[PDB]
Amino acid sequence: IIGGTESKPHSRPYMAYLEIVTSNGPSKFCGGFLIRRNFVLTAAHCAGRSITVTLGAHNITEEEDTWQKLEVIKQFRHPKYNTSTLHHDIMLLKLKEKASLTLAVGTLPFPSQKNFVPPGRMCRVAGWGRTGVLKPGSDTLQEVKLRLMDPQACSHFRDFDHNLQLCVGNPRKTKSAFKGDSGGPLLCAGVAQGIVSYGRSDAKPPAVFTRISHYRPWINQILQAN
Ligand SMILES: CN(C)C(=O)Cc1c(C(=O)O)n(Cc2csc3ccc(F)cc23)c2ccccc12
Numbered sequence: 144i145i146g147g148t149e150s151k152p153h154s155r156p157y158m159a160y161l162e163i164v165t166s167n168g169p170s171k172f173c174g175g176f177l178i179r180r181n182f183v184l185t186a187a188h189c190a191g192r193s194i195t196v197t198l199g200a201h202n203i204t205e206e207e208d209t210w211q212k213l214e215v216i217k218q219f220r221h222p223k224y225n226t227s228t229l230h231h232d233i234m235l236l237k238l239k240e241k242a243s244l245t246l247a248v249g250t251l252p253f254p255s256q257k258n259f260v261p262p263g264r265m266c267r268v269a270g271w272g273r274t275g276v277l278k279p280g281s282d283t284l285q286e287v288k289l290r291l292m293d294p295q296a297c298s299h300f301r302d303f304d305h306n307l308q309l310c311v312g313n314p315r316k317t318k319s320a321f322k323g324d325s326g327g328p329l330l331c332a333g334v335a336q337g338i339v340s341y342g343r344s345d346a347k348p349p350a351v352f353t354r355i356s357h358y359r360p361w362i363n364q365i366l367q368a369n
């Protein structure tokens with residue numbers, strides 16, 4: 144998160160810190176959010192050979208009792224996830240066990256409504272991602288309020304699609320989700336509407352978020368089947 148604030152610790156108790164293992168490189172990290180006690184939603188590009196989720200974190204470098212380090216038993220990457228277009232950059236992680244609900248860990252279930260969120264409002268995204276291009280991932284959960292932009296603000300992402308994705312972050316500001324924030328929720332009035340997907344390497348907003356409304360059926364499908 145660039146240009147954000149440190150979250151009040153544990154104020155976003157659904158936030159998941161994902162450590163994503165691959166065979167051929169060191170861990171990568173993503174965010175995500177717990178939408179059921181045993182499911183974390185994140186970005187598909189956060190898939191890996193295995194993923195650990197840490198719930199209850201604030202400073203991810205400082206173990207604390209709020210932490211729940213949970214094994215992911217299965218990744219449900221959106222079947223249409225396209226590594227070229229980055230369409231359908233969404234993934235559900237089924238945790239091996241249901242997380243404990245604590246003050247610091249709770250789910251963020253979707254409201255029934257899955258209304259398409261038009262441009263214009265401010266939403267908040269949180270993550271432990273980089274706080275600038277040259278900055279490592281934040282030890283602490285950060286969050287930033289970003290403007291939902293009209294889709295044309297993301298035109299330059301040539302595979303951006305307004306129906307699939309939110310365009311997030313006023314380009315006039317440096318505030319943005321960034322690397323390491325992948326998979327984090329964009330909450331608009333406390334409702335997850337976006338998932339950090341991608342943006343420019345140089346961190347110039349807007350960034351592209353998966354538009355959750357579009358994937359609600361798929362999410363539901365996975366949740367109901369698993
Ligand atoms: C498993 N991971 C994390 C990786 O493989 C590396 C990776 C990252 C990352 O490092 O976060 N992002 C997000 C990202 C890149 S530039 C940018 C700008 C603004 C913004 F919000 C997000 C982003 C990806 C998107 C698609 C494919 C891969 C990645």
Ligand SMILES: [Zn+2]
Nearest residue numbers: 152201207209
């Ligand atoms: Zn704490």
